Amino acid sequence: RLIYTAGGYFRQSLSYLEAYNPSDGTWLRLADLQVPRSGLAGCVVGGLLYAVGGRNNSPDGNTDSSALDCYNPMTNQWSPCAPMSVPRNRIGVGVIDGHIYAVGGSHGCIHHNSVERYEPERDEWHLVAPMLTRRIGVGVAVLNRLLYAVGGFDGTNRLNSAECYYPERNEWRMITAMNTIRSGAGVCVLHNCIYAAGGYDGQDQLNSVERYDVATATWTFVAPMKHRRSALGITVHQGRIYVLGGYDGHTFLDSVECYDPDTDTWSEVTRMTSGRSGVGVAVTMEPSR
């Protein structure tokens, strides 16, 4: 029931965990991340909210993060998990069958093509087959138990290419590229389509939104957001898409926009308590309190 946003960046990495109630209007302030992190991803397995990778930008210094941390709304408490094999700033993650897949990201000057899988019931990570492409700022979505990695930055070029991970074959296969090159887009799975919203093509922050249909293996341009934004947070709540924050080339946005697929329209629904980009976002049960 609530939209949780963890971490982010507002001229320094942030610790915030805040949850938006799309009915009430309210933002709830919850327990801070142990460590401030930007460029992380969020996901939910078995009701727990996971914060994965990212980077700690502080005045004391900067360090990419391999950390996995788990938040429990019934206790309003964070607990650490076993970390990834490598730090991963600007990671994408997706969940297949109760397992968390960590995709791409960077570590200093290394641009990962590696991919690894977390099993919550054993608190253990294992490497899986690497992507065909090094991708940082990669968008990740799962559609029909397949894991898609969309766009990103390979360290030299930004990418419109997409590829598809078959968990039980353990291999990646290229699929149809998007219309638009995008790093730091919001990618999620609505109904039966993969959406890719915003991002950065190396010249402009983007407001366009496109969506992949597996059946026709085709990307179709849809209604664009109101605000160009890169490094936005994104999630799906009650059959609608929410995008949070991001960076428009000048300001760190607090704008939250909501996409209604039955009307193909975006509208602004709230403002975050403060502008930020690079947050981790996901949906789970509201805190007991």
PDB file of N, CA, C and O in Angstrom, residues 197-269:
ATOM      1  N   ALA A 197      11.002   5.362 -19.073  1.00  0.00           N
ATOM      2  CA  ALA A 197      10.588   6.760 -18.976  1.00  0.00           C
ATOM      3  C   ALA A 197      11.807   7.593 -18.684  1.00  0.00           C
ATOM      4  O   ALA A 197      12.556   7.250 -17.777  1.00  0.00           O
ATOM      5  N   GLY A 198      11.954   8.695 -19.406  1.00  0.00           N
ATOM      6  CA  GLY A 198      13.000   9.673 -19.183  1.00  0.00           C
ATOM      7  C   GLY A 198      14.408   9.135 -19.416  1.00  0.00           C
ATOM      8  O   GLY A 198      14.664   8.280 -20.291  1.00  0.00           O
ATOM      9  N   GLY A 199      15.331   9.613 -18.600  1.00  0.00           N
ATOM     10  CA  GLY A 199      16.734   9.312 -18.820  1.00  0.00           C
ATOM     11  C   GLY A 199      17.477  10.459 -19.463  1.00  0.00           C
ATOM     12  O   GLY A 199      16.992  11.594 -19.584  1.00  0.00           O
ATOM     13  N   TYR A 200      18.691  10.140 -19.880  1.00  0.00           N
ATOM     14  CA  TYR A 200      19.654  11.091 -20.406  1.00  0.00           C
ATOM     15  C   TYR A 200      20.287  10.449 -21.640  1.00  0.00           C
ATOM     16  O   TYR A 200      20.702   9.284 -21.576  1.00  0.00           O
ATOM     17  N   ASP A 201      20.331  11.171 -22.773  1.00  0.00           N
ATOM     18  CA  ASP A 201      20.953  10.595 -23.968  1.00  0.00           C
ATOM     19  C   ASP A 201      22.337  11.164 -24.220  1.00  0.00           C
ATOM     20  O   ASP A 201      22.838  11.024 -25.319  1.00  0.00           O
ATOM     21  N   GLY A 202      22.929  11.879 -23.252  1.00  0.00           N
ATOM     22  CA  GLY A 202      24.224  12.470 -23.457  1.00  0.00           C
ATOM     23  C   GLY A 202      24.141  13.868 -23.998  1.00  0.00           C
ATOM     24  O   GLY A 202      25.145  14.470 -24.238  1.00  0.00           O
ATOM     25  N   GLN A 203      22.954  14.389 -24.213  1.00  0.00           N
ATOM     26  CA  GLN A 203      22.804  15.766 -24.647  1.00  0.00           C
ATOM     27  C   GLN A 203      21.667  16.410 -23.852  1.00  0.00           C
ATOM     28  O   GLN A 203      21.831  17.493 -23.288  1.00  0.00           O
ATOM     29  N   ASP A 204      20.521  15.724 -23.785  1.00  0.00           N
ATOM     30  CA  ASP A 204      19.328  16.208 -23.125  1.00  0.00           C
ATOM     31  C   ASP A 204      18.825  15.184 -22.107  1.00  0.00           C
ATOM     32  O   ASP A 204      18.951  13.968 -22.304  1.00  0.00           O
ATOM     33  N   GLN A 205      18.302  15.700 -20.997  1.00  0.00           N
ATOM     34  CA  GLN A 205      17.365  14.929 -20.188  1.00  0.00           C
ATOM     35  C   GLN A 205      16.059  14.834 -20.958  1.00  0.00           C
ATOM     36  O   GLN A 205      15.689  15.772 -21.682  1.00  0.00           O
ATOM     37  N   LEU A 206      15.374  13.688 -20.796  1.00  0.00           N
ATOM     38  CA  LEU A 206      14.255  13.223 -21.611  1.00  0.00           C
ATOM     39  C   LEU A 206      12.944  13.234 -20.853  1.00  0.00           C
ATOM     40  O   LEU A 206      12.892  12.920 -19.654  1.00  0.00           O
ATOM     41  N   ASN A 207      11.867  13.535 -21.566  1.00  0.00           N
ATOM     42  CA  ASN A 207      10.568  13.377 -20.965  1.00  0.00           C
ATOM     43  C   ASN A 207       9.774  12.340 -21.728  1.00  0.00           C
ATOM     44  O   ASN A 207       8.624  12.068 -21.389  1.00  0.00           O
ATOM     45  N   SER A 208      10.352  11.751 -22.744  1.00  0.00           N
ATOM     46  CA  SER A 208       9.568  10.800 -23.480  1.00  0.00           C
ATOM     47  C   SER A 208       9.530   9.457 -22.745  1.00  0.00           C
ATOM     48  O   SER A 208      10.378   9.124 -21.918  1.00  0.00           O
ATOM     49  N   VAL A 209       8.538   8.671 -23.098  1.00  0.00           N
ATOM     50  CA  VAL A 209       8.237   7.403 -22.430  1.00  0.00           C
ATOM     51  C   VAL A 209       7.886   6.409 -23.512  1.00  0.00           C
ATOM     52  O   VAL A 209       7.069   6.703 -24.394  1.00  0.00           O
ATOM     53  N   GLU A 210       8.500   5.247 -23.466  1.00  0.00           N
ATOM     54  CA  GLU A 210       8.187   4.254 -24.481  1.00  0.00           C
ATOM     55  C   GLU A 210       8.029   2.901 -23.802  1.00  0.00           C
ATOM     56  O   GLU A 210       8.420   2.705 -22.656  1.00  0.00           O
ATOM     57  N   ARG A 211       7.360   2.005 -24.497  1.00  0.00           N
ATOM     58  CA  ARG A 211       6.902   0.780 -23.868  1.00  0.00           C
ATOM     59  C   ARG A 211       7.020  -0.367 -24.853  1.00  0.00           C
ATOM     60  O   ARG A 211       6.738  -0.232 -26.057  1.00  0.00           O
ATOM     61  N   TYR A 212       7.493  -1.464 -24.304  1.00  0.00           N
ATOM     62  CA  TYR A 212       7.821  -2.633 -25.059  1.00  0.00           C
ATOM     63  C   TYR A 212       6.706  -3.657 -24.913  1.00  0.00           C
ATOM     64  O   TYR A 212       6.238  -3.952 -23.812  1.00  0.00           O
ATOM     65  N   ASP A 213       6.338  -4.221 -26.031  1.00  0.00           N
ATOM     66  CA  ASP A 213       5.379  -5.266 -26.038  1.00  0.00           C
ATOM     67  C   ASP A 213       6.109  -6.532 -26.407  1.00  0.00           C
ATOM     68  O   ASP A 213       6.694  -6.606 -27.429  1.00  0.00           O
ATOM     69  N   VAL A 214       6.105  -7.512 -25.534  1.00  0.00           N
ATOM     70  CA  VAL A 214       6.787  -8.753 -25.810  1.00  0.00           C
ATOM     71  C   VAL A 214       6.186  -9.467 -26.990  1.00  0.00           C
ATOM     72  O   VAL A 214       6.880 -10.000 -27.798  1.00  0.00           O
ATOM     73  N   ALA A 215       4.883  -9.459 -27.088  1.00  0.00           N
ATOM     74  CA  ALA A 215       4.234 -10.118 -28.189  1.00  0.00           C
ATOM     75  C   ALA A 215       4.675  -9.609 -29.536  1.00  0.00           C
ATOM     76  O   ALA A 215       4.924 -10.381 -30.426  1.00  0.00           O
ATOM     77  N   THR A 216       4.790  -8.311 -29.699  1.00  0.00           N
ATOM     78  CA  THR A 216       5.186  -7.813 -30.985  1.00  0.00           C
ATOM     79  C   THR A 216       6.626  -7.452 -31.054  1.00  0.00           C
ATOM     80  O   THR A 216       7.068  -6.989 -32.060  1.00  0.00           O
ATOM     81  N   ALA A 217       7.345  -7.655 -29.961  1.00  0.00           N
ATOM     82  CA  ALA A 217       8.756  -7.269 -29.807  1.00  0.00           C
ATOM     83  C   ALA A 217       9.027  -5.878 -30.358  1.00  0.00           C
ATOM     84  O   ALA A 217       9.903  -5.690 -31.145  1.00  0.00           O
ATOM     85  N   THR A 218       8.257  -4.908 -29.915  1.00  0.00           N
ATOM     86  CA  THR A 218       8.321  -3.586 -30.468  1.00  0.00           C
ATOM     87  C   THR A 218       8.158  -2.524 -29.406  1.00  0.00           C
ATOM     88  O   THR A 218       7.464  -2.712 -28.454  1.00  0.00           O
ATOM     89  N   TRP A 219       8.896  -1.453 -29.543  1.00  0.00           N
ATOM     90  CA  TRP A 219       8.771  -0.310 -28.644  1.00  0.00           C
ATOM     91  C   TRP A 219       7.869   0.737 -29.271  1.00  0.00           C
ATOM     92  O   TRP A 219       8.079   1.110 -30.422  1.00  0.00           O
ATOM     93  N   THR A 220       6.877   1.201 -28.520  1.00  0.00           N
ATOM     94  CA  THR A 220       5.947   2.208 -29.017  1.00  0.00           C
ATOM     95  C   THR A 220       5.965   3.456 -28.142  1.00  0.00           C
ATOM     96  O   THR A 220       5.832   3.371 -26.921  1.00  0.00           O
ATOM     97  N   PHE A 221       6.130   4.613 -28.774  1.00  0.00           N
ATOM     98  CA  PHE A 221       6.167   5.880 -28.054  1.00  0.00           C
ATOM     99  C   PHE A 221       4.800   6.232 -27.478  1.00  0.00           C
ATOM    100  O   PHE A 221       3.791   6.200 -28.182  1.00  0.00           O
ATOM    101  N   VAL A 222       4.776   6.567 -26.192  1.00  0.00           N
ATOM    102  CA  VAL A 222       3.536   6.928 -25.517  1.00  0.00           C
ATOM    103  C   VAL A 222       3.601   8.359 -24.995  1.00  0.00           C
ATOM    104  O   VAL A 222       4.571   9.076 -25.242  1.00  0.00           O
ATOM    105  N   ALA A 223       2.564   8.770 -24.272  1.00  0.00           N
ATOM    106  CA  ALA A 223       2.506  10.114 -23.712  1.00  0.00           C
ATOM    107  C   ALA A 223       3.746  10.408 -22.875  1.00  0.00           C
ATOM    108  O   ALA A 223       4.125   9.609 -22.019  1.00  0.00           O
ATOM    109  N   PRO A 224       4.383  11.562 -23.122  1.00  0.00           N
ATOM    110  CA  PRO A 224       5.589  11.937 -22.373  1.00  0.00           C
ATOM    111  C   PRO A 224       5.249  12.558 -21.018  1.00  0.00           C
ATOM    112  O   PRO A 224       4.171  13.120 -20.794  1.00  0.00           O
ATOM    113  N   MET A 225       6.199  12.434 -20.088  1.00  0.00           N
ATOM    114  CA  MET A 225       6.040  13.105 -18.797  1.00  0.00           C
ATOM    115  C   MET A 225       6.053  14.619 -18.993  1.00  0.00           C
ATOM    116  O   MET A 225       6.516  15.149 -20.036  1.00  0.00           O
ATOM    117  N   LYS A 226       5.608  15.318 -17.933  1.00  0.00           N
ATOM    118  CA  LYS A 226       5.677  16.788 -17.909  1.00  0.00           C
ATOM    119  C   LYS A 226       7.091  17.275 -17.727  1.00  0.00           C
ATOM    120  O   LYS A 226       7.475  18.305 -18.276  1.00  0.00           O
ATOM    121  N   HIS A 227       7.896  16.562 -16.975  1.00  0.00           N
ATOM    122  CA  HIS A 227       9.222  17.073 -16.653  1.00  0.00           C
ATOM    123  C   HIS A 227      10.266  16.107 -17.164  1.00  0.00           C
ATOM    124  O   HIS A 227      10.239  14.916 -16.825  1.00  0.00           O
ATOM    125  N   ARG A 228      11.132  16.612 -18.030  1.00  0.00           N
ATOM    126  CA  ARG A 228      12.344  15.903 -18.371  1.00  0.00           C
ATOM    127  C   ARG A 228      13.053  15.553 -17.081  1.00  0.00           C
ATOM    128  O   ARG A 228      13.224  16.401 -16.192  1.00  0.00           O
ATOM    129  N   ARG A 229      13.553  14.336 -17.008  1.00  0.00           N
ATOM    130  CA  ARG A 229      14.232  13.978 -15.784  1.00  0.00           C
ATOM    131  C   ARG A 229      15.135  12.784 -16.070  1.00  0.00           C
ATOM    132  O   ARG A 229      14.742  11.875 -16.805  1.00  0.00           O
ATOM    133  N   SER A 230      16.348  12.794 -15.499  1.00  0.00           N
ATOM    134  CA  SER A 230      17.210  11.633 -15.543  1.00  0.00           C
ATOM    135  C   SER A 230      17.434  11.155 -14.108  1.00  0.00           C
ATOM    136  O   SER A 230      17.321  11.944 -13.163  1.00  0.00           O
ATOM    137  N   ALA A 231      17.738   9.857 -13.934  1.00  0.00           N
ATOM    138  CA  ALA A 231      18.044   9.297 -12.607  1.00  0.00           C
ATOM    139  C   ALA A 231      16.846   9.454 -11.676  1.00  0.00           C
ATOM    140  O   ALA A 231      16.997   9.819 -10.508  1.00  0.00           O
ATOM    141  N   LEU A 232      15.666   9.266 -12.244  1.00  0.00           N
ATOM    142  CA  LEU A 232      14.386   9.257 -11.551  1.00  0.00           C
ATOM    143  C   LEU A 232      14.124   7.913 -10.863  1.00  0.00           C
ATOM    144  O   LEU A 232      14.619   6.866 -11.275  1.00  0.00           O
ATOM    145  N   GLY A 233      13.282   7.942  -9.828  1.00  0.00           N
ATOM    146  CA  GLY A 233      12.799   6.722  -9.230  1.00  0.00           C
ATOM    147  C   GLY A 233      11.455   6.386  -9.893  1.00  0.00           C
ATOM    148  O   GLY A 233      10.735   7.273 -10.373  1.00  0.00           O
ATOM    149  N   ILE A 234      11.103   5.101  -9.914  1.00  0.00           N
ATOM    150  CA  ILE A 234       9.891   4.692 -10.615  1.00  0.00           C
ATOM    151  C   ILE A 234       9.323   3.480  -9.913  1.00  0.00           C
ATOM    152  O   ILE A 234      10.058   2.618  -9.427  1.00  0.00           O
ATOM    153  N   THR A 235       7.997   3.392  -9.887  1.00  0.00           N
ATOM    154  CA  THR A 235       7.365   2.179  -9.407  1.00  0.00           C
ATOM    155  C   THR A 235       5.926   2.096  -9.901  1.00  0.00           C
ATOM    156  O   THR A 235       5.361   3.040 -10.470  1.00  0.00           O
ATOM    157  N   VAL A 236       5.312   0.959  -9.643  1.00  0.00           N
ATOM    158  CA  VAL A 236       3.928   0.766 -10.037  1.00  0.00           C
ATOM    159  C   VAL A 236       3.136   0.576  -8.775  1.00  0.00           C
ATOM    160  O   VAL A 236       3.498  -0.265  -7.939  1.00  0.00           O
ATOM    161  N   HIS A 237       2.087   1.386  -8.622  1.00  0.00           N
ATOM    162  CA  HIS A 237       1.163   1.269  -7.500  1.00  0.00           C
ATOM    163  C   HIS A 237      -0.265   1.291  -8.052  1.00  0.00           C
ATOM    164  O   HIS A 237      -0.643   2.224  -8.777  1.00  0.00           O
ATOM    165  N   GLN A 238      -1.032   0.256  -7.724  1.00  0.00           N
ATOM    166  CA  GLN A 238      -2.432   0.087  -8.140  1.00  0.00           C
ATOM    167  C   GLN A 238      -2.659   0.373  -9.633  1.00  0.00           C
ATOM    168  O   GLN A 238      -3.507   1.190 -10.034  1.00  0.00           O
ATOM    169  N   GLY A 239      -1.926  -0.353 -10.465  1.00  0.00           N
ATOM    170  CA  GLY A 239      -2.113  -0.169 -11.902  1.00  0.00           C
ATOM    171  C   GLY A 239      -1.724   1.188 -12.484  1.00  0.00           C
ATOM    172  O   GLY A 239      -2.192   1.527 -13.571  1.00  0.00           O
ATOM    173  N   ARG A 240      -0.933   1.999 -11.777  1.00  0.00           N
ATOM    174  CA  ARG A 240      -0.428   3.263 -12.311  1.00  0.00           C
ATOM    175  C   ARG A 240       1.068   3.355 -12.081  1.00  0.00           C
ATOM    176  O   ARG A 240       1.613   2.729 -11.175  1.00  0.00           O
ATOM    177  N   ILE A 241       1.729   4.160 -12.897  1.00  0.00           N
ATOM    178  CA  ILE A 241       3.164   4.356 -12.794  1.00  0.00           C
ATOM    179  C   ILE A 241       3.427   5.629 -12.010  1.00  0.00           C
ATOM    180  O   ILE A 241       2.756   6.656 -12.192  1.00  0.00           O
ATOM    181  N   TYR A 242       4.406   5.576 -11.143  1.00  0.00           N
ATOM    182  CA  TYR A 242       4.842   6.758 -10.411  1.00  0.00           C
ATOM    183  C   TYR A 242       6.323   6.947 -10.689  1.00  0.00           C
ATOM    184  O   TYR A 242       7.093   5.973 -10.636  1.00  0.00           O
ATOM    185  N   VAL A 243       6.706   8.194 -11.027  1.00  0.00           N
ATOM    186  CA  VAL A 243       8.102   8.588 -11.162  1.00  0.00           C
ATOM    187  C   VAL A 243       8.388   9.710 -10.182  1.00  0.00           C
ATOM    188  O   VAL A 243       7.587  10.638 -10.012  1.00  0.00           O
ATOM    189  N   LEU A 244       9.534   9.613  -9.531  1.00  0.00           N
ATOM    190  CA  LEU A 244       9.847  10.438  -8.374  1.00  0.00           C
ATOM    191  C   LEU A 244      11.151  11.162  -8.629  1.00  0.00           C
ATOM    192  O   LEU A 244      12.179  10.509  -8.807  1.00  0.00           O
ATOM    193  N   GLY A 245      11.132  12.486  -8.550  1.00  0.00           N
ATOM    194  CA  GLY A 245      12.428  13.167  -8.542  1.00  0.00           C
ATOM    195  C   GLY A 245      13.186  13.003  -9.854  1.00  0.00           C
ATOM    196  O   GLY A 245      12.609  12.769 -10.936  1.00  0.00           O
ATOM    197  N   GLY A 246      14.505  13.010  -9.731  1.00  0.00           N
ATOM    198  CA  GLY A 246      15.415  13.016 -10.847  1.00  0.00           C
ATOM    199  C   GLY A 246      16.004  14.404 -11.019  1.00  0.00           C
ATOM    200  O   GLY A 246      15.821  15.317 -10.185  1.00  0.00           O
ATOM    201  N   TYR A 247      16.729  14.552 -12.124  1.00  0.00           N
ATOM    202  CA  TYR A 247      17.586  15.708 -12.377  1.00  0.00           C
ATOM    203  C   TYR A 247      17.292  16.229 -13.778  1.00  0.00           C
ATOM    204  O   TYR A 247      17.266  15.438 -14.721  1.00  0.00           O
ATOM    205  N   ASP A 248      16.965  17.517 -13.926  1.00  0.00           N
ATOM    206  CA  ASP A 248      16.513  18.000 -15.236  1.00  0.00           C
ATOM    207  C   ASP A 248      17.608  18.808 -15.977  1.00  0.00           C
ATOM    208  O   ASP A 248      17.321  19.641 -16.864  1.00  0.00           O
ATOM    209  N   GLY A 249      18.873  18.604 -15.610  1.00  0.00           N
ATOM    210  CA  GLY A 249      19.943  19.445 -16.073  1.00  0.00           C
ATOM    211  C   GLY A 249      20.207  20.683 -15.230  1.00  0.00           C
ATOM    212  O   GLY A 249      21.293  21.290 -15.377  1.00  0.00           O
ATOM    213  N   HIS A 250      19.252  21.101 -14.385  1.00  0.00           N
ATOM    214  CA  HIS A 250      19.467  22.282 -13.539  1.00  0.00           C
ATOM    215  C   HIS A 250      19.156  22.070 -12.073  1.00  0.00           C
ATOM    216  O   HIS A 250      19.915  22.506 -11.203  1.00  0.00           O
ATOM    217  N   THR A 251      18.020  21.450 -11.790  1.00  0.00           N
ATOM    218  CA  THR A 251      17.558  21.259 -10.432  1.00  0.00           C
ATOM    219  C   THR A 251      17.339  19.782 -10.161  1.00  0.00           C
ATOM    220  O   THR A 251      17.067  18.978 -11.068  1.00  0.00           O
ATOM    221  N   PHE A 252      17.501  19.435  -8.905  1.00  0.00           N
ATOM    222  CA  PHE A 252      17.064  18.147  -8.385  1.00  0.00           C
ATOM    223  C   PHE A 252      15.567  18.238  -8.089  1.00  0.00           C
ATOM    224  O   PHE A 252      15.149  19.044  -7.256  1.00  0.00           O
ATOM    225  N   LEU A 253      14.750  17.478  -8.809  1.00  0.00           N
ATOM    226  CA  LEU A 253      13.298  17.676  -8.752  1.00  0.00           C
ATOM    227  C   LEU A 253      12.701  17.015  -7.525  1.00  0.00           C
ATOM    228  O   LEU A 253      13.182  15.948  -7.070  1.00  0.00           O
ATOM    229  N   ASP A 254      11.584  17.606  -7.042  1.00  0.00           N
ATOM    230  CA  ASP A 254      10.748  16.941  -6.072  1.00  0.00           C
ATOM    231  C   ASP A 254       9.427  16.471  -6.691  1.00  0.00           C
ATOM    232  O   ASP A 254       8.669  15.744  -6.051  1.00  0.00           O
ATOM    233  N   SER A 255       9.153  16.868  -7.916  1.00  0.00           N
ATOM    234  CA  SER A 255       7.983  16.473  -8.682  1.00  0.00           C
ATOM    235  C   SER A 255       7.734  14.970  -8.635  1.00  0.00           C
ATOM    236  O   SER A 255       8.640  14.166  -8.922  1.00  0.00           O
ATOM    237  N   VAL A 256       6.494  14.578  -8.351  1.00  0.00           N
ATOM    238  CA  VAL A 256       6.088  13.172  -8.521  1.00  0.00           C
ATOM    239  C   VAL A 256       4.975  13.146  -9.534  1.00  0.00           C
ATOM    240  O   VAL A 256       3.955  13.834  -9.364  1.00  0.00           O
ATOM    241  N   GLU A 257       5.184  12.387 -10.608  1.00  0.00           N
ATOM    242  CA  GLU A 257       4.212  12.297 -11.690  1.00  0.00           C
ATOM    243  C   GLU A 257       3.649  10.878 -11.749  1.00  0.00           C
ATOM    244  O   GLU A 257       4.337   9.890 -11.448  1.00  0.00           O
ATOM    245  N   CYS A 258       2.409  10.784 -12.194  1.00  0.00           N
ATOM    246  CA  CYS A 258       1.665   9.543 -12.161  1.00  0.00           C
ATOM    247  C   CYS A 258       1.050   9.282 -13.513  1.00  0.00           C
ATOM    248  O   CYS A 258       0.301  10.115 -14.013  1.00  0.00           O
ATOM    249  N   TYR A 259       1.328   8.130 -14.083  1.00  0.00           N
ATOM    250  CA  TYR A 259       0.832   7.790 -15.417  1.00  0.00           C
ATOM    251  C   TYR A 259      -0.396   6.879 -15.321  1.00  0.00           C
ATOM    252  O   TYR A 259      -0.332   5.815 -14.698  1.00  0.00           O
ATOM    253  N   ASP A 260      -1.506   7.291 -15.961  1.00  0.00           N
ATOM    254  CA  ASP A 260      -2.716   6.480 -16.039  1.00  0.00           C
ATOM    255  C   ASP A 260      -2.766   5.803 -17.408  1.00  0.00           C
ATOM    256  O   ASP A 260      -3.001   6.485 -18.421  1.00  0.00           O
ATOM    257  N   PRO A 261      -2.546   4.496 -17.497  1.00  0.00           N
ATOM    258  CA  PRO A 261      -2.491   3.876 -18.811  1.00  0.00           C
ATOM    259  C   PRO A 261      -3.838   3.823 -19.479  1.00  0.00           C
ATOM    260  O   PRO A 261      -3.889   3.807 -20.710  1.00  0.00           O
ATOM    261  N   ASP A 262      -4.944   3.794 -18.737  1.00  0.00           N
ATOM    262  CA  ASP A 262      -6.223   3.762 -19.457  1.00  0.00           C
ATOM    263  C   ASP A 262      -6.476   5.063 -20.186  1.00  0.00           C
ATOM    264  O   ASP A 262      -7.197   5.072 -21.174  1.00  0.00           O
ATOM    265  N   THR A 263      -5.938   6.185 -19.699  1.00  0.00           N
ATOM    266  CA  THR A 263      -6.130   7.446 -20.404  1.00  0.00           C
ATOM    267  C   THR A 263      -4.864   7.911 -21.098  1.00  0.00           C
ATOM    268  O   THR A 263      -4.858   8.996 -21.671  1.00  0.00           O
ATOM    269  N   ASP A 264      -3.791   7.136 -21.045  1.00  0.00           N
ATOM    270  CA  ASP A 264      -2.493   7.583 -21.561  1.00  0.00           C
ATOM    271  C   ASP A 264      -2.182   9.030 -21.147  1.00  0.00           C
ATOM    272  O   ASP A 264      -1.844   9.865 -21.977  1.00  0.00           O
ATOM    273  N   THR A 265      -2.341   9.347 -19.861  1.00  0.00           N
ATOM    274  CA  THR A 265      -2.028  10.695 -19.386  1.00  0.00           C
ATOM    275  C   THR A 265      -1.195  10.653 -18.113  1.00  0.00           C
ATOM    276  O   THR A 265      -1.346   9.754 -17.283  1.00  0.00           O
ATOM    277  N   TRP A 266      -0.288  11.617 -18.014  1.00  0.00           N
ATOM    278  CA  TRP A 266       0.521  11.918 -16.840  1.00  0.00           C
ATOM    279  C   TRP A 266      -0.117  13.061 -16.062  1.00  0.00           C
ATOM    280  O   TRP A 266      -0.667  13.985 -16.658  1.00  0.00           O
ATOM    281  N   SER A 267      -0.066  13.007 -14.742  1.00  0.00           N
ATOM    282  CA  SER A 267      -0.411  14.203 -13.967  1.00  0.00           C
ATOM    283  C   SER A 267       0.494  14.288 -12.747  1.00  0.00           C
ATOM    284  O   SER A 267       1.013  13.270 -12.285  1.00  0.00           O
ATOM    285  N   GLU A 268       0.706  15.496 -12.238  1.00  0.00           N
ATOM    286  CA  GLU A 268       1.525  15.650 -11.041  1.00  0.00           C
ATOM    287  C   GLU A 268       0.652  15.392  -9.829  1.00  0.00           C
ATOM    288  O   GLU A 268      -0.394  16.009  -9.675  1.00  0.00           O
ATOM    289  N   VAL A 269       1.088  14.523  -8.943  1.00  0.00           N
ATOM    290  CA  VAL A 269       0.262  14.176  -7.795  1.00  0.00           C
ATOM    291  C   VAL A 269       0.826  14.684  -6.473  1.00  0.00           C
ATOM    292  O   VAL A 269       0.047  14.975  -5.561  1.00  0.00           O
TER     293      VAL A 269
END
